[PDB]
Design a protein around this ligand. Structure first.
Ligand code: C9L
Length: 154
């Protein structure tokens, strides 16, 4: 089976917001905000909730931009990540226990300190293209298989 997750990228014309994960799963890597969808909330609800929790930020509209399925070898549940983006945010991002936020110019995205799959699908994000992705990981650094396609409906 699969578990739903969310990922929220605040993409502004000349910069993208990322957070350095301070503890837990994926510590020491920059990434968007997000996490597990809870029982009782929509996916979009959970994306807004984790955005608020990890950065203090609220948004008016999130747009569906991607879906990436992850398999980790030896882990039974696939991770079904729904990727959202927004330009217009509400508030100034602040550090949480989980995330230290920072803006990045679009030409200085810290790919070598991000999840490896980001190098593959982030360009599609920056092109405002919608995508389906699949990545199979051995551990947390090695991509063994992957597929990536642009779609019409996420
Ligand atoms: C491990 C799954 C994952 C990943 N795969 C390697 N790549 C990125 N950029 N984000 C991920 N998530 C986003 C949701 C919350 C958990 C971490």
């Amino acid at each position: 089976a699969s578990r739903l997750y969310t990922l929220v990228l605040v993409l502004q014309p000349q910069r993208v917001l990322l957070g350095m994960k301070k503890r837990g799963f994926g510590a020491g890597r920059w990434n968007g905000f997000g996490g597990k969808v809870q029982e009782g909330e929509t996916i979009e609800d959970g994306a807004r909730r984790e955005l608020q929790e990890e950065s203090g930020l609220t948004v008016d509209a999130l747009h569906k931009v991607g879906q990436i399925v992850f398999e980790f070898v030896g882990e039974p549940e696939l991770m079904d990540v729904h990727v959202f983006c927004t330009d217009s945010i509400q508030g100034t991002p602040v550090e949480s226990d989980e995330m230290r936020p920072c803006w990045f110019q679009l030409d200085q995205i810290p790919f070598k300190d991000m999840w490896p799959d980001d190098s593959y699908w982030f360009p599609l994000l920056l092109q405002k293209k919608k995508f389906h992705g699949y990545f199979k990981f051995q551990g947390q650094d090695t991509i063994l298989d992957y597929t990536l396609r642009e779609v019409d409906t996420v």
